[PDB]
Amino acid sequence: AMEPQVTLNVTFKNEIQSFLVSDPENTTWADIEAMVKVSFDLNTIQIKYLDEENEEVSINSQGEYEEALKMAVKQGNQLQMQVHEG
Ligand SMILES: [Cl-]
């Protein structure tokens, strides 16, 4: 303990931003969604991530977020995320 830094590489269309998140166990999904919305100027979003099955899967909740981070720890402390609006 605790989880170390995670990198969120977030694509919106042809734009990508990487967010360094120092202590992911100390973050909520709401904080993360807010950062993404502010970065890309979006109101309603849907975020998805590449899992170990190489499948794009929705994060819609704190729970889903914490499961994504468990996996990021296995995958060199980073997540590939895709944002779509609506
Ligand atoms: Cl939303």
From Swiss-Prot:
Induction: Upon viral infection. (Microbial infection) Cleaved by S.pyogenes SpeB protease; leading to its degradation. Degradation by SpeB prevents autophagy, promoting to S.pyogenes intracellular replication. It is found in: Cytoplasm; Cytoplasmic vesicle, Autophagosome; Lysosome; Cytoplasm, Myofibril, Sarcomere, M line. Residues 5-86 form the PB1 domain. Signal peptide: none annotated. It comes from the Eukaryota. Homooligomer and heterooligomer. Interacts with TRIM55. Interacts with titin/TTN. Interacts with RNF29, USP8, MAP1LC3A, MAP1LC3B, MAP1LC3C, GABARAP, GABARAPL1 and GABARAPL2. Binds to ubiquitin and ubiquitinated proteins. Interacts with SQSTM1. Interacts with TAX1BP1. Interacts with IRF3; this interaction mediates autophagic degradation of IRF3. Interacts with IL12A and IL12B. (Microbial infection) Interacts with Influenza A virus protein PB1; this interaction promotes NBR1-mediated selective autophagic degradation of MAVS. The PB1 domain mediates interaction with SQSTM1. Ubiquitin-binding autophagy adapter that participates in different processes including host defense or intracellular homeostasis. Possesses a double function during the selective autophagy by acting as a shuttle bringing ubiquitinated proteins to autophagosomes and also by participating in the formation of protein aggregates. Plays a role in the regulation of the innate immune response by modulating type I interferon production and targeting ubiquitinated IRF3 for autophagic degradation. This is Next to BRCA1 gene 1 protein. It comes from Homo sapiens (Human). The chain holds residues 1 to 85 of 966 of the full protein.
